[PDB]
Amino acid sequence: SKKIGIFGGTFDPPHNGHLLMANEVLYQAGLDEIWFMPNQIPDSFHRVEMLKLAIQSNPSFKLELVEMEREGPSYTFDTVSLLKQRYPNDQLFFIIGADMIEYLPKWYKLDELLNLIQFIGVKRPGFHVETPYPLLFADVPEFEVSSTMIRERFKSKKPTDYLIPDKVKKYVEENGLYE
Amino acid sequence: SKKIGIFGGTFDPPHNGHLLMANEVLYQAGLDEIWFMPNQIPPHTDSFHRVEMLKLAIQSNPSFKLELVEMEREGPSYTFDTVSLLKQRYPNDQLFFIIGADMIEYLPKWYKIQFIGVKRPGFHVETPYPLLFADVPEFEVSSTMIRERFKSKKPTDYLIPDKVKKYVEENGLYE
Amino acid sequence: SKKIGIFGGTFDPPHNGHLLMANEVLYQAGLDEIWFMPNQITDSFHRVEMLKLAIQSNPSFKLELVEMEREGPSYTFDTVSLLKQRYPNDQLFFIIGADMIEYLPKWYKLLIQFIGVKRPGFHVETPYPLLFADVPEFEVSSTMIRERFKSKKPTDYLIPDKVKKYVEENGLYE
Amino acid sequence: SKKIGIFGGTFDPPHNGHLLMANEVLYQAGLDEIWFMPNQIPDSFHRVEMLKLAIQSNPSFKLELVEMEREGPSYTFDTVSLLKQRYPNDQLFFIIGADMIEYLPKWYKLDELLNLIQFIGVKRPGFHVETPYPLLFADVPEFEVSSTMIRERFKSKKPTDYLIPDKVKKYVEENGLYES
């Protein structure tokens, strides 16, 4: 019924590069929704709140907090397996860099995962990801912004305009984050 | 016990981007050798050809080696994947597999033997894995791009080793 | 005397790449204002309206139509000359791209100064004692955006929503 | 009679990125030769010897030392004017980054330089260049290598394999260069 694009990350904090990549994959892979799935380290409520603010304006974007759950999964196989059990009627896709598995030799563990859920490999306009694997590709325009660059900019008091949503910036300032 | 970097790929043909990445991983990760491992499709460029071009591409580098374990996974009743057969043959060595991290900012914990990520210098990557990276200078060259060049008669200089180009020519490969 | 960054362009349409580059030059080179200067040769009117919308939210950005007033019917000034003519005491900084090649030639015999823009980490050598602004890469252009509008592809996160809104209701870009 | 591509740089030292770019332009702009023109110091002996070594393998690559001459030109207009005078029957082209002039407003001093000689703008595959100016364009695969990175690698004792020609590395190490 629904084509869901699983989009993982730290989103510490979420930024324009995240929104851009998600929208491009959404359109290019003909998906219905993109689920922003924040990972967890064994703070979080701040990441959850900045994410909600970042995605608000895009009806096609959702927040998936399965990894935040008590005794929740963290390994992709487990996380994807649970989501498949919760949404058996939907078609799930997993987003990765198109080059993540380019240099790997034949590996059953990888194949098991690739057969569990349809992988979408993100790459820059043009460019070829050789190595044969079941993969849907999505060309996304390069936008060199990262959560780490953003954090240091806040710390060093450098501008963040056009790199992060205004609402995210406002939330960061009000909560004394990345000081 | 040696530190070995495993480099999978089709290598049709092998190019300077392959050589560069392998060498950077080799020194930045403090490894002893890099093993180039040509893959093969189930009959669905010929392998002996890709293997020959590889030998030529890595000749000049002593730390580079050709390994054909993916070409010998088939047993009379059981078939190993490349990773398991390698561990079988070299149980005492430290095998490092290479993971790309040049397109996305985050790397998922998709795997439950070590890994080395390769990204462009300056490119920030976050991941739950305590992973060591190798900052490889960007080199927008691929086998696909190279094949198109041979076919369309465009230059290949500085993109592929001269000996590999010579092989392609002496064997009429790539239209 | 202000420190003014001159930002030439076709801006049809203006996009987030333009705003980001301007903001970075503005701050990194410690300037007071950045002047977006549409070249003349989409009709000027629309490009001018889209530009106002694009820069509105940023106080340090200004629209300057001097390149559109270079004709005084007997003599035509080039933009640089009319600017010095109008603001002789201000410090005018022109922006030079240096993100494709390693070297920047001494092509100009140099009130007028230059600022180079390149990706962070990209090393540039030049005989010029030039200040560079490290602008994060953003692979977006006007041409690319026009094509997306024409083929009904997304433009979200690439251009300001107000610019997109203006394009749609004015039936611009087919 | 000859279509020449003027390729300026510090070439301190020359590396594979230079050779690649030059070959691509040559082919893409249908040129006959590419002239590597070392810029005047705002020593040179070593840069010149490495350049000779770097281009030896390509018959289409030539060395142009006009900026090295006593009382020689250093500004593009001056340099090009002298070269056009020395080679009146050939068609010269000047190589620059395609974005060099992308952000400049109408300027006659630039127009004058562009009419003096045909400019070629190098850029990455795809990605457009707005630029209300002549310019012939040449798409060149991105090869993230520069003379700065190389020098730092020699200093830090990092590998330079596949980044610079063997003969160049040989020259650097024989003359103990860049280990500052």
CSV table of N, CA and C in Angstrom, one decimal, chain C residues 21-134:
chain,number,residue,atom,x,y,z
C,21,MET,N,26.4,31.4,-0.8
C,21,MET,CA,27.6,32.0,-1.2
C,21,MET,C,27.8,33.4,-0.7
C,22,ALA,N,26.7,34.2,-0.8
C,22,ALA,CA,26.7,35.6,-0.4
C,22,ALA,C,26.9,35.7,1.1
C,23,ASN,N,26.2,34.9,1.9
C,23,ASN,CA,26.3,35.0,3.3
C,23,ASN,C,27.7,34.6,3.8
C,24,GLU,N,28.3,33.6,3.2
C,24,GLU,CA,29.6,33.2,3.5
C,24,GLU,C,30.7,34.2,3.2
C,25,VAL,N,30.5,34.8,2.0
C,25,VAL,CA,31.5,35.9,1.6
C,25,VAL,C,31.3,37.0,2.6
C,26,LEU,N,30.1,37.4,2.8
C,26,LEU,CA,29.8,38.5,3.7
C,26,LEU,C,30.5,38.4,5.1
C,27,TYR,N,30.3,37.2,5.7
C,27,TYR,CA,30.9,37.0,7.0
C,27,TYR,C,32.4,36.7,7.0
C,28,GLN,N,32.8,35.7,6.2
C,28,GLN,CA,34.2,35.4,6.1
C,28,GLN,C,35.1,36.5,5.7
C,29,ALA,N,34.7,37.4,4.9
C,29,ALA,CA,35.5,38.5,4.5
C,29,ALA,C,35.2,39.8,5.3
C,30,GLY,N,34.4,39.7,6.3
C,30,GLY,CA,34.0,40.8,7.1
C,30,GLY,C,33.5,42.0,6.4
C,31,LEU,N,32.5,41.8,5.5
C,31,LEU,CA,32.0,42.9,4.7
C,31,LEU,C,30.7,43.5,5.4
C,32,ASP,N,30.2,44.6,5.0
C,32,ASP,CA,29.0,45.2,5.6
C,32,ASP,C,27.8,44.8,4.8
C,33,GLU,N,27.9,44.8,3.5
C,33,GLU,CA,26.7,44.4,2.6
C,33,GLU,C,27.2,43.6,1.4
C,34,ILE,N,26.2,42.9,0.8
C,34,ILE,CA,26.5,42.2,-0.4
C,34,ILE,C,25.4,42.7,-1.4
C,35,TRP,N,25.9,43.2,-2.5
C,35,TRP,CA,24.9,43.7,-3.5
C,35,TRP,C,24.7,42.7,-4.7
C,36,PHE,N,23.5,42.2,-4.7
C,36,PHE,CA,23.1,41.3,-5.8
C,36,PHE,C,22.9,42.2,-7.1
C,37,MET,N,23.7,41.9,-8.1
C,37,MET,CA,23.6,42.7,-9.4
C,37,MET,C,23.2,41.9,-10.6
C,38,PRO,N,21.9,41.9,-10.9
C,38,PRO,CA,21.4,41.1,-12.1
C,38,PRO,C,22.0,41.7,-13.4
C,39,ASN,N,22.6,40.9,-14.2
C,39,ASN,CA,23.1,41.4,-15.5
C,39,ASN,C,21.8,41.5,-16.4
C,40,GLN,N,21.9,42.3,-17.4
C,40,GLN,CA,20.7,42.5,-18.2
C,40,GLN,C,20.7,41.9,-19.7
C,41,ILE,N,21.8,42.2,-20.4
C,41,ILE,CA,22.0,41.7,-21.8
C,41,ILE,C,21.3,42.7,-22.8
C,42,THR,N,14.7,35.1,-19.2
C,42,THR,CA,13.6,35.6,-18.4
C,42,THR,C,13.7,37.2,-18.4
C,43,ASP,N,12.6,37.8,-18.6
C,43,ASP,CA,12.6,39.3,-18.5
C,43,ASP,C,13.1,39.9,-17.2
C,44,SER,N,13.8,40.9,-17.3
C,44,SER,CA,14.4,41.6,-16.2
C,44,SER,C,13.4,41.8,-15.0
C,45,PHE,N,12.2,42.3,-15.4
C,45,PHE,CA,11.2,42.5,-14.4
C,45,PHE,C,11.0,41.3,-13.4
C,46,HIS,N,10.8,40.1,-13.9
C,46,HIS,CA,10.6,38.9,-13.1
C,46,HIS,C,11.8,38.6,-12.3
C,47,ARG,N,13.0,38.6,-12.9
C,47,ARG,CA,14.2,38.3,-12.2
C,47,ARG,C,14.4,39.3,-11.1
C,48,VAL,N,14.0,40.6,-11.3
C,48,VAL,CA,14.2,41.6,-10.2
C,48,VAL,C,13.2,41.3,-9.1
C,49,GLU,N,11.9,40.9,-9.4
C,49,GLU,CA,11.0,40.5,-8.4
C,49,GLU,C,11.4,39.3,-7.7
C,50,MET,N,11.9,38.3,-8.4
C,50,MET,CA,12.3,37.0,-7.7
C,50,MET,C,13.5,37.3,-6.7
C,51,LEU,N,14.4,38.2,-7.1
C,51,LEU,CA,15.5,38.6,-6.3
C,51,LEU,C,15.2,39.3,-5.0
C,52,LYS,N,14.2,40.2,-5.1
C,52,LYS,CA,13.7,40.9,-3.9
C,52,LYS,C,13.3,39.8,-2.8
C,53,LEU,N,12.4,38.9,-3.3
C,53,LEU,CA,11.9,37.9,-2.4
C,53,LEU,C,13.0,37.0,-1.9
C,54,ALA,N,13.9,36.6,-2.7
C,54,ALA,CA,15.1,35.8,-2.3
C,54,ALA,C,15.9,36.4,-1.1
C,55,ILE,N,16.2,37.7,-1.3
C,55,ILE,CA,17.0,38.4,-0.3
C,55,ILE,C,16.3,39.1,0.9
C,56,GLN,N,15.0,39.3,0.8
C,56,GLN,CA,14.2,39.9,1.8
C,56,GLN,C,14.6,39.6,3.3
C,57,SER,N,14.7,38.4,3.6
C,57,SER,CA,15.0,38.0,5.0
C,57,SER,C,16.3,38.3,5.6
C,58,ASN,N,17.3,38.7,4.7
C,58,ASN,CA,18.6,39.0,5.1
C,58,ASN,C,18.9,40.5,5.0
C,59,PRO,N,19.1,41.1,6.1
C,59,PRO,CA,19.4,42.6,6.3
C,59,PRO,C,20.6,43.1,5.6
C,60,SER,N,21.6,42.2,5.4
C,60,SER,CA,22.9,42.6,4.8
C,60,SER,C,22.9,42.5,3.2
C,61,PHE,N,21.8,42.0,2.7
C,61,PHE,CA,21.7,41.8,1.2
C,61,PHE,C,20.9,42.9,0.6
C,62,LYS,N,21.4,43.4,-0.5
C,62,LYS,CA,20.7,44.5,-1.2
C,62,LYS,C,20.7,44.2,-2.7
C,63,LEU,N,19.6,44.8,-3.3
C,63,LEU,CA,19.5,44.6,-4.8
C,63,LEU,C,20.0,45.9,-5.4
C,64,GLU,N,20.9,45.8,-6.4
C,64,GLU,CA,21.4,47.0,-7.0
C,64,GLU,C,21.3,46.8,-8.5
C,65,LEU,N,20.6,47.7,-9.2
C,65,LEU,CA,20.3,47.7,-10.6
C,65,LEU,C,21.2,48.6,-11.5
C,66,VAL,N,22.4,48.8,-11.0
C,66,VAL,CA,23.3,49.7,-11.8
C,66,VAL,C,23.6,49.1,-13.2
C,67,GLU,N,23.7,47.8,-13.3
C,67,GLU,CA,24.1,47.2,-14.6
C,67,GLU,C,22.9,47.4,-15.5
C,68,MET,N,21.8,47.8,-15.0
C,68,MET,CA,20.5,48.0,-15.8
C,68,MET,C,20.4,49.5,-16.2
C,69,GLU,N,21.3,50.3,-15.6
C,69,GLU,CA,21.2,51.8,-15.8
C,69,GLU,C,22.5,52.2,-16.4
C,70,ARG,N,23.3,51.3,-17.0
C,70,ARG,CA,24.5,51.6,-17.6
C,70,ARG,C,24.4,52.5,-18.9
C,71,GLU,N,23.2,52.6,-19.5
C,71,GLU,CA,23.0,53.4,-20.7
C,71,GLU,C,22.5,54.8,-20.3
C,72,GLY,N,23.3,55.8,-20.7
C,72,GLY,CA,22.9,57.2,-20.5
C,72,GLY,C,22.7,57.8,-21.9
C,73,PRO,N,22.2,57.0,-22.9
C,73,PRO,CA,21.9,57.3,-24.3
C,73,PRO,C,23.0,57.8,-25.3
C,74,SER,N,24.1,58.2,-24.8
C,74,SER,CA,25.2,58.7,-25.7
C,74,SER,C,26.5,57.9,-25.3
C,75,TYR,N,26.5,57.4,-24.1
C,75,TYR,CA,27.7,56.6,-23.6
C,75,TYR,C,27.2,55.5,-22.7
C,76,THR,N,27.7,54.4,-22.8
C,76,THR,CA,27.3,53.2,-22.0
C,76,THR,C,28.5,52.9,-21.1
C,77,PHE,N,28.3,52.9,-19.8
C,77,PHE,CA,29.3,52.6,-18.8
C,77,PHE,C,29.3,51.1,-18.6
C,78,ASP,N,30.3,50.5,-18.1
C,78,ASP,CA,30.3,49.1,-17.7
C,78,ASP,C,29.9,49.2,-16.2
C,79,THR,N,29.5,48.1,-15.6
C,79,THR,CA,29.1,48.2,-14.2
C,79,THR,C,30.1,48.7,-13.2
C,80,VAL,N,31.4,48.2,-13.3
C,80,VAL,CA,32.4,48.6,-12.4
C,80,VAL,C,32.6,50.1,-12.4
C,81,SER,N,32.6,50.7,-13.6
C,81,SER,CA,32.8,52.1,-13.8
C,81,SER,C,31.7,53.0,-13.2
C,82,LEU,N,30.5,52.6,-13.4
C,82,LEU,CA,29.4,53.3,-12.9
C,82,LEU,C,29.3,53.2,-11.3
C,83,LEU,N,29.7,52.1,-10.8
C,83,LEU,CA,29.8,51.9,-9.4
C,83,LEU,C,30.8,52.8,-8.7
C,84,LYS,N,32.0,52.9,-9.2
C,84,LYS,CA,33.0,53.8,-8.7
C,84,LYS,C,32.6,55.2,-8.8
C,85,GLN,N,31.9,55.4,-9.9
C,85,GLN,CA,31.3,56.7,-10.3
C,85,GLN,C,30.3,57.1,-9.2
C,86,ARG,N,29.5,56.2,-8.7
C,86,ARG,CA,28.4,56.4,-7.7
C,86,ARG,C,28.9,56.3,-6.3
C,87,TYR,N,29.9,55.4,-6.0
C,87,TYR,CA,30.4,55.2,-4.7
C,87,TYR,C,31.9,55.2,-4.7
C,88,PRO,N,32.5,56.3,-5.0
C,88,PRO,CA,34.0,56.5,-5.1
C,88,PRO,C,34.8,56.2,-3.8
C,89,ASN,N,34.1,56.4,-2.6
C,89,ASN,CA,34.8,56.2,-1.4
C,89,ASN,C,34.6,54.8,-0.7
C,90,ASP,N,33.6,54.0,-1.2
C,90,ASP,CA,33.4,52.7,-0.6
C,90,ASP,C,34.4,51.7,-1.1
C,91,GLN,N,34.6,50.7,-0.3
C,91,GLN,CA,35.5,49.6,-0.6
C,91,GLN,C,34.7,48.5,-1.3
C,92,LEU,N,34.9,48.4,-2.7
C,92,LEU,CA,34.2,47.4,-3.5
C,92,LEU,C,35.0,46.1,-3.6
C,93,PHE,N,34.4,45.0,-3.2
C,93,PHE,CA,35.1,43.7,-3.3
C,93,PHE,C,34.3,42.9,-4.3
C,94,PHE,N,35.1,42.5,-5.4
C,94,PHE,CA,34.5,41.7,-6.4
C,94,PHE,C,34.8,40.2,-6.2
C,95,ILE,N,33.9,39.3,-6.5
C,95,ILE,CA,34.0,37.9,-6.2
C,95,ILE,C,34.5,37.1,-7.4
C,96,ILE,N,35.6,36.3,-7.2
C,96,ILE,CA,36.3,35.5,-8.2
C,96,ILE,C,36.1,34.0,-7.9
C,97,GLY,N,35.6,33.3,-8.8
C,97,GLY,CA,35.5,31.8,-8.6
C,97,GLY,C,36.8,31.2,-8.7
C,98,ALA,N,37.1,30.3,-7.8
C,98,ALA,CA,38.4,29.6,-7.8
C,98,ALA,C,38.2,28.2,-7.3
C,99,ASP,N,37.1,27.6,-7.7
C,99,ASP,CA,36.7,26.2,-7.3
C,99,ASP,C,36.9,25.1,-8.3
C,100,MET,N,37.3,25.4,-9.5
C,100,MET,CA,37.5,24.4,-10.5
C,100,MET,C,39.0,24.1,-10.8
C,101,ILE,N,39.8,25.2,-10.8
C,101,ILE,CA,41.2,25.1,-11.0
C,101,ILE,C,42.1,25.4,-9.8
C,102,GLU,N,43.2,24.8,-9.7
C,102,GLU,CA,44.2,25.0,-8.6
C,102,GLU,C,44.8,26.3,-8.6
C,103,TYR,N,45.0,26.9,-9.8
C,103,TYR,CA,45.7,28.2,-10.0
C,103,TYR,C,44.8,29.3,-10.5
C,104,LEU,N,45.0,30.5,-10.0
C,104,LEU,CA,44.3,31.7,-10.4
C,104,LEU,C,45.3,32.7,-10.9
C,105,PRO,N,45.3,33.0,-12.2
C,105,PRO,CA,46.2,33.9,-12.9
C,105,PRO,C,46.1,35.4,-12.5
C,106,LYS,N,47.2,36.1,-12.7
C,106,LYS,CA,47.2,37.5,-12.4
C,106,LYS,C,46.7,38.2,-13.7
C,107,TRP,N,45.4,38.0,-13.9
C,107,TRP,CA,44.7,38.6,-15.1
C,107,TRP,C,44.3,40.0,-15.0
C,108,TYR,N,44.3,40.6,-13.8
C,108,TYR,CA,44.0,42.0,-13.6
C,108,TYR,C,45.0,42.8,-12.9
C,109,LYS,N,45.3,44.0,-13.4
C,109,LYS,CA,46.3,44.9,-12.8
C,109,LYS,C,45.5,45.7,-11.8
C,110,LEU,N,45.6,45.3,-10.5
C,110,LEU,CA,45.0,46.0,-9.4
C,110,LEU,C,46.1,46.7,-8.5
C,111,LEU,N,40.7,50.8,-3.6
C,111,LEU,CA,39.3,50.9,-3.7
C,111,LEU,C,38.6,49.6,-4.3
C,112,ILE,N,39.3,49.0,-5.2
C,112,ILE,CA,38.8,47.7,-5.8
C,112,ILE,C,39.6,46.6,-5.3
C,113,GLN,N,39.0,45.6,-4.8
C,113,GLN,CA,39.6,44.4,-4.3
C,113,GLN,C,38.8,43.2,-4.7
C,114,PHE,N,39.4,42.0,-4.5
C,114,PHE,CA,38.8,40.8,-4.9
C,114,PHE,C,38.7,39.8,-3.8
C,115,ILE,N,37.8,38.8,-3.9
C,115,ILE,CA,37.7,37.8,-2.8
C,115,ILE,C,37.4,36.5,-3.6
C,116,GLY,N,38.2,35.5,-3.3
C,116,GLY,CA,38.0,34.2,-4.0
C,116,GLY,C,37.0,33.3,-3.2
C,117,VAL,N,36.3,32.5,-4.0
C,117,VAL,CA,35.3,31.6,-3.3
C,117,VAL,C,35.7,30.2,-3.8
C,118,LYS,N,35.9,29.3,-2.8
C,118,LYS,CA,36.2,27.9,-3.1
C,118,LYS,C,35.7,27.0,-2.0
C,119,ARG,N,35.6,25.7,-2.3
C,119,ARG,CA,35.2,24.8,-1.3
C,119,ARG,C,36.2,24.7,-0.2
C,120,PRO,N,35.8,24.4,1.1
C,120,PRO,CA,36.8,24.3,2.1
C,120,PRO,C,37.7,23.1,1.8
C,121,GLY,N,39.0,23.3,2.0
C,121,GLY,CA,40.0,22.3,1.8
C,121,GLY,C,40.6,22.3,0.4
C,122,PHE,N,39.8,22.9,-0.6
C,122,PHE,CA,40.3,23.1,-1.9
C,122,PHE,C,41.5,24.1,-1.9
C,123,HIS,N,42.7,23.6,-2.2
C,123,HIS,CA,43.9,24.5,-2.2
C,123,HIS,C,44.0,25.3,-3.5
C,124,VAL,N,44.2,26.6,-3.3
C,124,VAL,CA,44.4,27.5,-4.5
C,124,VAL,C,45.6,28.3,-4.4
C,125,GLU,N,46.4,28.3,-5.4
C,125,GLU,CA,47.6,29.1,-5.4
C,125,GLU,C,47.5,30.3,-6.4
C,126,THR,N,48.0,31.5,-6.0
C,126,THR,CA,47.9,32.6,-6.8
C,126,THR,C,48.9,33.7,-6.5
C,127,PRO,N,49.4,34.4,-7.5
C,127,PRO,CA,50.4,35.4,-7.2
C,127,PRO,C,49.7,36.6,-6.4
C,128,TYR,N,48.4,36.6,-6.4
C,128,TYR,CA,47.6,37.6,-5.7
C,128,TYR,C,47.5,37.4,-4.2
C,129,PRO,N,47.7,38.4,-3.4
C,129,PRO,CA,47.6,38.3,-1.9
C,129,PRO,C,46.1,38.4,-1.6
C,130,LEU,N,45.4,37.4,-2.1
C,130,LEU,CA,43.9,37.3,-2.0
C,130,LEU,C,43.3,36.6,-0.8
C,131,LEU,N,42.2,37.1,-0.3
C,131,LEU,CA,41.5,36.5,0.8
C,131,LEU,C,40.4,35.6,0.1
C,132,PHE,N,40.3,34.4,0.7
C,132,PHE,CA,39.4,33.4,0.1
C,132,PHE,C,38.3,33.1,1.1
C,133,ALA,N,37.1,32.8,0.6
C,133,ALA,CA,36.0,32.5,1.5
C,133,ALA,C,35.7,31.0,1.2
C,134,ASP,N,35.7,30.2,2.2
C,134,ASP,CA,35.4,28.7,2.1
C,134,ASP,C,33.9,28.5,2.1
